[PDB]
Prior knowledge:
Blueprint: E1 9-11, E2 22-26, H1 31-40, H2 42-47, E3 56-60, H3 66-82, H4 85-98, H5 105-114, H6 119-126, H7 129-144, E4 152-155, E5 159-161, H8 171-187
Parallel strand pairs: 2-3
Antiparallel strand pairs: 1-5, 2-4, 4-5
PDB class: oxidoreductase
Keywords: disulfide oxidoreductase, redox protein, dsba, oxidoreductase
Assembly: monomeric
Amino acid sequence: AQYEDGKQYTTLEKPVAGAPQVLEFFSFFCPHCYQFEEVLHISDNVKKKLPEGVKMTKYHVNFMGGDLGKDLTQAWAVAMALGVEDKVTVPLFEGVQKTQTIRSASDIRDVFINAGIKGEEYDAAWNSFVVKSLVAQQEKAAADVQLRGVPAMFVNGKYQLNPQGMDTSNMDVFVQQYADTVKYLSEK
């Protein structure tokens, strides 16, 4: 077949019930994640090819970057709670990996302030139980699939993308193969 288990994707031998339809994991410390998001725009090209009625979820992970890594998982929870993912993703990635100006929770907070989120609003969210539950959801989802590396994408808690079985000579062509594969898995 054109799409085969074990080449463009793998099947979880332990399928996760009630998992989000399309679930992406990343870390702001993850170099391939910077490429995925800032250069390839994987999330965006996938969403644009998803069937109607299929929603996309993206979660941060703790297992890179130590203390600051967990702070970023909580910050990403704040981003999700406030609905400002599309304003803070680029400066968080560039702050960690490009300028290396993010070294503390306060530096993370500066990114949101510069993005126009009010200090009181950020602080209230940071300390909120709604954000605590969002941190919990992120941790649970990664735990459900025994997650050990990023970037990663899962479809219906059943299938996991396998980009290493793909031609990367042309970045455009790789991205569309990735997206077409997610669409195929979504219709399975």
